[PDB]
C-alpha cells in the first residue's frame, strides 16, 4: 500500500501537454533532444493525408 | 368444510385420534351447525369404510 500512482491536476497535465506541443515546433529544442532533423526542410513538419 | 355450511346429514367421529386436537372441536362445531354427530369407535373401522387404513372422520 505504498503510493504508486500520483494524482495530477487535469489543467496542469494539459498545460504540460500544450508546452510539449509548442516545443515540438521549436527547432533548437528538437536538436537539443537529439532528433536528427537537420536535413528536414522545416519543422513543425506536415504531410498529406496520403500518409 | 361440509359442516361449516351444513351440507352434512350425519358425521361420525373416531375416538382413536392420536393428536386429539384434530377432532376436539368436531362435536362443538357439529352442535353449532346443528348436524347429528356420533363419536364412533375405531378410526380403523372408518378407514376400512372408505377403503383406507385410517380416516378418523366419516
Amino acid at each position: 500500500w505504498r503510493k504508486w500512482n500520483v494524482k495530477v491536476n487535469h489543467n496542469e497535465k494539459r498545460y504540460a501537454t500544450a508546452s510539449a506541443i509548442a516545443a515540438t515546433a521549436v527547432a533548437s529544442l528538437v536538436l537539443a533532444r537529439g532528433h536528427r532533423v537537420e536535413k528536414i526542410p522545416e519543422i513543425p513538419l506536415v504531410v498529406s493525408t496520403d500518409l | 368444510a361440509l359442516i361449516e355450511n351444513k351440507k352434512a346429514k350425519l358425521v361420525l367421529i373416531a375416538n382413536d385420534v392420536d393428536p386429539i386436537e384434530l377432532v376436539v372441536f368436531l362435536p362443538a362445531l357439529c352442535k353449532k351447525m346443528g348436524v347429528p354427530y356420533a363419536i364412533v369407535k375405531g378410526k380403523a373401522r372408518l378407514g376400512t369404510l372408505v377403503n383406507q387404513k385410517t380416516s378418523a372422520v366419516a
Partner: protein, 99 residues
C-alpha cells in the same frame, strides 16, 4: 391536508395536487373476517378461560376495574393490552349476565 407552500409551519411543504392512491390490501390486515370470528368463537366454546383470566373476572367482580387493569398490566405486557383484556373480560361478564 394540503401543504401551505411555505418551508415553515405546521403544514410546511410544496403545494401540489394530490390523487389519494388506491389503498393497498396490505392495509386491510387487522380487519376481522367472518371465517375467523366463527372459528375463534367455536374454539372458545371448547377451550375455556385461563387462570389469570378467571382471576381478572373475579377482580372485576369484587375489587374493581382499576385493580383488574393493574393486575392485567402485570400479567400481560403493556398498559394498552391490560385495558383491552379488561374490556374483553367485561364483555364476558356482560354476556354471562345477559344469557
Amino acid at each position: 391536508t394540503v401543504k401551505t407552500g411555505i418551508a415553515i409551519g405546521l403544514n410546511k411543504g410544496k403545494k401540489v395536487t394530490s390523487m389519494t392512491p388506491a389503498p393497498k390490501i396490505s392495509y386491510k390486515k387487522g380487519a376481522a373476517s367472518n371465517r375467523t370470528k366463527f372459528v375463534r368463537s367455536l374454539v372458545r366454546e371448547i377451550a375455556g378461560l385461563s387462570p389469570y383470566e378467571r382471576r381478572l373476572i373475579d377482580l372485576i367482580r369484587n375489587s374493581g376495574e382499576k385493580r383488574a387493569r393493574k393486575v392485567a398490566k402485570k400479567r400481560l405486557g403493556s398498559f394498552t393490552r391490560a385495558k383491552a383484556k379488561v374490556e374483553e373480560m367485561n364483555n364476558i361478564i356482560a354476556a354471562s349476565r345477559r344469557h
